Amino acid sequence: MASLPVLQKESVFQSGAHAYRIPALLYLPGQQSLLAFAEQRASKKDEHAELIVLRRGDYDAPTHQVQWQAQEVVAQARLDGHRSMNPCPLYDAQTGTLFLFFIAIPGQVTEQQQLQTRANVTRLCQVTSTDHGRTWSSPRDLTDAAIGPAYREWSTFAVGPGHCLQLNDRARSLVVPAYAYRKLHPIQRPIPSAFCFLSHDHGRTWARGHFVAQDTLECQVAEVEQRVVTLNARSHLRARVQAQSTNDGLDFQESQLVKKLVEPPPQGCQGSVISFPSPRSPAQWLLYTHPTHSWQRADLGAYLNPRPPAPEAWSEPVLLAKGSCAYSDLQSMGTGPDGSPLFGCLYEANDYEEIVFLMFTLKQAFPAEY
Ligand SMILES: CC(=O)N[C@H]1[C@H]([C@H](O)[C@H](O)CO)OC(C(=O)O)=C[C@@H]1O
């Protein structure tokens, strides 16, 4: 009945003068340290988002523990008179440039307002850093160059939330997952769909990836063995929707509903997925974390997929945290102290009053595999 015994469990963000929701985790391999982002909201309500905070954590080897440095505001991540939300970090392994994509919405203008008004006022922004997050660039509002023509086709949009992807294609392309509320019917309300923002010139210029099966929300993507881009998305149904792309995220040919991966009643809850080298035919497996309770957001579980992307291959979950659990973001941290794949997990806990950092090896969560 207890949670899974892990290598680490520390509360990295807590309620105080501000509340903190919507976590993001980035593993800088050349540093052997993580970057944890989160929304610093004046309250726990979405419209009360304000800026994005950051904390750098450095993995100590002798102790197999991570040590976080004081939290700080990524002051640059924001547009004049706009709030910031949905941090989506990504490290370009080739140029060594750190990217932090985010959303900028005018003051306290709600999401709901944009939806029932069918008037998109959200803006796609990004900030870069060439010193591991120590200093950032001036914010770059990509709204025009990435969306442009389609901006009026959406009631509203958002990126992530969570870490992004960089394919191992000829050009090492950046893939920023997302979803959008598309105005398709004159009467029927706009239905959201997942999709990815693509870039093949290392952030110079972006492009919109094509949508997936209707009714998909926040999502994440991971690459796996020829070469595919599996995407896991939140849905208003009662289970996760996943899809595969064989053309580097430009289109998703296959799209199914995975019943083994449940979703809470309202409109589900953001979950997270990543891939890692396979311990033992396929070169990689997938790991996913999301609440396992079916009525509410609680009991964050970890799911394993040893035959990606076969839907039915997903495993039964393992309890990572008992009680109130919401959003989360995973990260492949390489080889763990016990020679198993190492994982870094950031998750929303206790009625959104703290964001917890979890660290465990594949051997701890899925011993059955060994
Ligand atoms: C950009 C934004 O406001 N995202 C919000 C998201 C969104 O409303 C839903 O995915 C429908 O699109 O919902 C939730 C949530 O706790 O479930 C918090 C997020 O901050």
Looking at the structure, give the CATH architecture of the domain made up of residues 1-370.
Answer: 6 Propeller (2.120)
Q: Which atom of ligand 1 is found nearest the CA of 326?
A: 16
* C-alpha span between 191 and 285 (Å, rounded): 31
Q: Which atom of ligand 1 is found nearest the CA of 122?
A: 1
* C-alpha span between 342 and 337 (Å, rounded): 8
Domain limits of the chain?
1-370
The pairing of strands 219-224 and 207-208 is unpaired
Retrieve residue 6's tokens.
């892990």
124, 155, 218: residue to mutate for ligand 1 pocket, most atoms within 8 A of CB: 218
Resolution (A): 2.8
Rounded alpha-carbon distances, angstroms, from residue 66 to 33, 193, 267, 273, 320: 8, 36, 34, 21, 18
Tell whether ligand 1 has an atom less than 6 A from the beta carbon of residue 46: yes
* C-alpha span between 66 and 343 (Å, rounded): 12
Q: Which residues belong to the annotated binding site?
A: 21, 41, 179, 181, 218, 234, 297
Backbone angles phi, psi at 177, to 5 degrees: -60, 160
Residues with Cβ within 8 Å of residue 316, at least 6 apart in sequence: 260, 303
Rounded alpha-carbon distances, angstroms, from residue 8 to 36, 327, 340, 358: 15, 18, 15, 5
Q: Whose CA is nearest to atom 18 of ligand 1?
A: 46
Q: Which residues belong to the annotated binding site for substrate?
A: 21, 41, 179, 181, 218, 234, 297
CA angle at 301 for the pair 45 and 193, rounded to the nearest 5° = 55
Rounded alpha-carbon distances, angstroms, from residue 23 to 20, 186, 275: 8, 36, 19
Tell whether ligand 1 has an atom less than 6 A from the beta carbon of residue 85: yes
Residues with Cβ within 8 Å of residue 48, at least 6 apart in sequence: 19, 41, 42, 108
Rounded alpha-carbon distances, angstroms, from residue 2 to 14, 199, 319, 352, 369: 23, 44, 8, 21, 21
Helices (H) and strands (E) in the chain, counts: 3, 25
Element (H, E) at 268: none
Retrieve residue 27's tokens.
């593993």
